Amino acid sequence: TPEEWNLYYPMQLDL
Amino acid sequence: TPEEWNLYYPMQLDL
Amino acid sequence: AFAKELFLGKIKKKEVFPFPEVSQDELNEINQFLGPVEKFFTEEVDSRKIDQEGKIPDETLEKLKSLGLFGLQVPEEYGGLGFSNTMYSRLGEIISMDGSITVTLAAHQAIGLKGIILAGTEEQKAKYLPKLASGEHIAAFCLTEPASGSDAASIRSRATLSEDKKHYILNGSKVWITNGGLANIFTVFAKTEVVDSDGSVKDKITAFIVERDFGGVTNGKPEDKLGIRGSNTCEVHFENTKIPVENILGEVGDGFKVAMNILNSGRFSMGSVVAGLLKRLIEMTAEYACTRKQFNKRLSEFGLIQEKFALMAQKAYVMESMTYLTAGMLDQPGFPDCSIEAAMVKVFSSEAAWQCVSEALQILGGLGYTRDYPYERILRDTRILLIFEGTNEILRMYIALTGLQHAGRILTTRIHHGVVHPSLADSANKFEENTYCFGRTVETLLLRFGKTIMEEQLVLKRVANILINLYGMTAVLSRASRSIRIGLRNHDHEVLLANTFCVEAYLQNLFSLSQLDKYAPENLDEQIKKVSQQILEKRAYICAHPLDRTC
Amino acid sequence: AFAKELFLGKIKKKEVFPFPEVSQDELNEINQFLGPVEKFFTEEVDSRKIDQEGKIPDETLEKLKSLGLFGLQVPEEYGGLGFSNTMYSRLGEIISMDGSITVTLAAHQAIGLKGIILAGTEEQKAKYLPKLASGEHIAAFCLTEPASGSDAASIRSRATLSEDKKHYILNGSKVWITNGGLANIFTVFAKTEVVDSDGSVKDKITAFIVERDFGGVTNGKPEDKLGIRGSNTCEVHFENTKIPVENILGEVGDGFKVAMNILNSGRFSMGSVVAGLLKRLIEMTAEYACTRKQFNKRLSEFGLIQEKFALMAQKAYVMESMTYLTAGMLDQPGFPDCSIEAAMVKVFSSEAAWQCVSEALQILGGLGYTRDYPYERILRDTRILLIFEGTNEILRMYIALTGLQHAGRILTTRIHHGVVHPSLADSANKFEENTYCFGRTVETLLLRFGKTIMEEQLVLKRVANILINLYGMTAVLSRASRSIRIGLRNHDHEVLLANTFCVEAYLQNLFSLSQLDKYAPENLDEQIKKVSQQILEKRAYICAHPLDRTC
């Protein structure tokens, strides 16, 4: 991810 | 009660 | 009817479940008529121009008059078209493109000239209907009057019979009159004195056919409404208007019956009207939700937009089913009394309109909040739908109390599903169970309260809601079963949209039927009365600020 | 925090239950600051004029600058006032009397100069803050770009470092920028290339402080918004803007952190902005309903208006509780990560605003649909609240995913009510049971779905709804317990409102948690997906007309 979409909501959950 | 009020909904029940 | 027997816990089939079928010959005629009308409405109607200017262009109004859309349901013998109720609901979907025309036309057809049709004599119809249907004259319905230090529902309009007994003299004023600035024929209701063998001074409501040529009729400037700017809503005052005695609808004193007949016989097409709008939204927002990228994905690929689209489709399906089911029961030979179903359709249609329109505007985000898109205008236009043709909370009492009249007479007198397709079997059992529970609960409510049920308007709101859901749970089981039986295109979508609504409505009715019991701990009706009573006796918010601190 | 550990089924009854208390001196100071502000907003501010003209008068803006409302939270050392988070929410209620000013001010304070405060150096603050707080300069937040054939969330803005290494050159364009035509200081985020030991061409987001005096900054005409017509929402274009290297917020490449901080810092105060507007509706509408007659009765004496007033009051109470609880948790020493609670407050406040405003407008009937009453304007103004400061469906995903990430860390690491008053005992047990059930359900969801939970947007919506309801319950319980303990005036009304909301929220959460199971027949999400997928692949309504026939 462009580490910009994470502003809207977190992405690529590290579980 | 005035009759025109029954134009909205029945004011009196026949019970 | 059908809804009045739902209060008794019985499902009246052979009237609802075989869905109204239209003959092949009739469908071709309506398609041939819709052709030019749809072509005109899609191309030559500028909704944005009408909304921004607040006036319907004269060319558009004249071209509408050419189409004969001002005399849709007027009998063919009087210069009209004589369309049935189903054939009128069909036209209501393609007319709703503007919103300011679906209000001008409905207020002239549904309530405007409907009085002359229902109660006018054969000589009154031969004088007013040929020119009302041709569009030369426009009709208005004058019932409500402005409450200033007086009751909002009482009629203070007066009609005094003259000394020579040749014409009445009318004095009064009316408010919220649609087409007030355009109408040439007014259906005015006024209280006139009646003397009988008793020798009393009892006055009764009487309906008149008041022409603007009678003199003494004056209307003010049009009101600055939020959404429907093209409509002409004025207030009309009659100052010593001389109405000939022959211009009386029905009989003197018998004006309440006419006013009840005009208002009740309508609103059903609204459910189709809004449906014809809702589908349009699905045809616009999808074109935006499939050509736009977010997070390297379509907007259509996100669950929170898919839920919106599915909700809109389910609402439109239930609305269309309700409207055509109601219009099919109004086309039966004779004069059927289906007025609860029309109020049901109006309430459901208005609520779904507001919710779905707001949610569609939410789909586009900040682009739909501007005046450059056709969602701002639609958002403002569909808000009147909860006030037009009757306030939604007034009609819930009408729905609940009219049916409790029917149950009351039967109860006092008594004291003193192999039609739905097998695939739709999980939803018919829920419908039967909910109907039986509703009948039992209505009997219990009548036993507990009785004539005091007028005061409990929170009990009647839950009764009016369970019954509204019960009508949508049988309109979508009749339509989907017919689709399966005939084998229409993509009937699996219809089955999916019918089984999805039935489950949700069954859950809603199951919740509401639990709150109509004496021992319900989840019933917040006593606590709402106290809080609201305190607020209204203080006429302001009561709770102190969270930062307040006492000694 | 509190919400993050709500996902684990644990109630942290140490930060939330003793309600934030404000000492007497601070209350006197805030009341002294009030007065000259409340009187100005009630008397010298013409909301109707601002809405109809579409431009805030220069005298009003000059007086707003004089009052110091442009530097409310700027530290006192930089020409501001240094107000805390519970003293800014207090002023939000007074500011909310316009809609076009509560948006201009918030976009300059919450998302404007907030970047310089959070990440600016001591020499940048000494240069921009004294003139940003004085009102001479206005700040804007430039993050999003117009999606035209590209993703709607990614950044295409470019900042190229010059040959002489003395200033960056910025090229890009931003859309939906509030105060675009008024701002002189822009907080622009652009992707700039960073070279490291790896020798790659990896680019990172970097925040700049772009002045309009830098040259190459141009903006278009303002948007034609529905409700907030006094605001100035333009799109700003940067064409070869020369930004000195010293005008970088923090460090190069550290723009995502700054953007996250600014976005998450400024959402808690919306609940008091609207609760201060809901309380204004309960005052005018109460006057109308108590001074009007219908059926020889007050409008206040009808149950269906009492329910509306009670719902409005309950919404306002819960909103104020949420806002002041969040602002009290944000006033603790250090830096708490209470970003989920701000999104909760925003979502609940926007939903309650829309519902209550529409319902209050419905109370007045057809009189509230005209432009001569202050309900049309309020109805249009509160629609942006579901879009302004994050869309409501984005924030539900934010809440759910931010909580589930923390829950996932805790579960992976593990694997590898005596504060409430005894009168509030029936509502604390419900809150505890719902919290325990929510923790169990979240654990089950994390076990079953894992990383797939990212795609399921209908499960996350239910999780967010349950968490929002839990936050509302705990906020109202804390406020009611404090009111009983201290003994404020009219605390029985507070107890009634708290108990009613707790019962309603408990029922809603019970349903939602019932719908979050593998074997739940009430769950309609495998059927919604099919219907929505069919609709979106056809891009139109699928079901045939009820009058359709097949041979």
Residue numbers in the entry:
A (entry chain D), B (entry chain C): 320 to 334
C (entry chain B), D (entry chain A): 38 to 453, 487 to 621
Q: How is this structure described in the published paper?
A:
The Mitochondrial Complex I Assembly (MCIA) complex is essential for the biogenesis of respiratory Complex I (CI), the first enzyme in the respiratory chain, which has been linked to Alzheimer’s disease (AD) pathogenesis. Here we report the structural basis of the complex formation between the MCIA subunits ECSIT and ACAD9. ECSIT binding induces a major conformational change in the FAD-binding loop of ACAD9, releasing the FAD cofactor and converting ACAD9 from a fatty acid β-oxidation (FAO) enzyme to a CI assembly factor. The inclusion of an additional N-terminal 26 residues in the ECSIT construct (hereafter named ECSITCTER, residues 221–431), combined with optimisation of the purification and subcomplex reconstitution protocols led to a 3.0 Å resolution cryo-EM structure of the ACAD9WT-ECSITCTER complex, enabling us to build and refine an atomic model that includes nearly all ACAD9 residues as well as a 15-residue peptide spanning ECSIT residues 320–334. As previously described, ACAD9 is present as a dimer, where the C-terminal regions (residues 600–621) form helix loops that are positioned around the neighbouring protomer thereby stabilising the active dimer.
The ECSIT binding site is located at the junction of the ACAD9 dehydrogenase and vestigial domains, with one ECSITCTER per ACAD9 protomer. ECSIT residues 322–328 form a 310-helix that interacts with the ACAD9 β1–β2 loop, while ECSIT residues 329–334 adopt an extended loop conformation lying in anti-parallel orientation between the ACAD9 α16 and η6 helices. Specifically, ECSIT Glu323 makes a salt bridge with ACAD9 Lys228, stabilising the ECSIT binding on the N-terminal segment with the ACAD9 β4 strand, whereas a second salt bridge between ECSIT Asp333 and ACAD9 Arg446 stabilises the ECSIT binding on the C-terminal end with the ACAD9 α16 helix. Furthermore, ECSIT directly interacts with the ACAD9 β1–β2 loop through three hydrogen bonds between ECSIT Trp324 and ACAD9 Ser191 and Asp188, respectively, and ECSIT Glu323 with the backbone amide of Ile192. Notably, while there is no evidence of direct ECSIT interactions with the second ACAD9 protomer, Asp188 shows an additional hydrogen bond with Asn333 on α11’–α12’ loop, bridging ECSIT binding with the ACAD9 dimer. Examination of the electrostatics properties of the binding interface shows that the surface of the ACAD9 is mainly positively charged whereas the modelled ECSIT sequence is mostly negative. In contrast, the loop adopts a very different conformation in the ACAD9WT-ECSITCTER model, where the tip of the β1-β2 loop (residue Gly186) moves by ~10 Å upwards to allow the ECSIT 310-helix to insert, suggesting that this mobile ACAD9 β1-β2 loop plays the role of a gatekeeper. Thr320 forms hydrogen bonds with Gln331, stabilising the helical sequence that enters into the ACAD9 binding cavity.
